[PDB]
Design a protein around this nucleic acid. Sequence first.
RNA 1: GUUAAAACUCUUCUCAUGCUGGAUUCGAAAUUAGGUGCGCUUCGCGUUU
Length: 96
Amino acid sequence: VDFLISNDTKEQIVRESTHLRIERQTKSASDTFKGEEVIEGATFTATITISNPQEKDLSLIQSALKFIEENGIGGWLNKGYGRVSFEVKSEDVATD
RNA sequence: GUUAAAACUCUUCUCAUGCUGGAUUCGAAAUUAGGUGCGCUUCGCGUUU
């Protein structure tokens, strides 16, 4: 399973952002921090390599990608960061 | 057939707080409820000395 490399560069997808921690009585920012994210609509690519292919391989990978599309990829997954869509193409190679 | 293989920099944390689309300027300038139509028609200051 190759790393999901991006198609674009740092200056075109990666932005720094103010994340916050607010008190529940004063309703003002207690702690501020600066975290980097990737903008939405950013196209990443990877290439999965299943050798010795069983019949329940592409379906299982697609099922796992749907589980990743709803839970998220990366970190800070519970606060809403990481929801993506996956588009999938497949190819067997026989002779070179 | 790689000192391999195996192991997701993961979890926790709201860009929030403070700031009123406010200030100035008159629906008023022009236009006569005017024009037409007769309080008229009928009845003697009698009678009585």
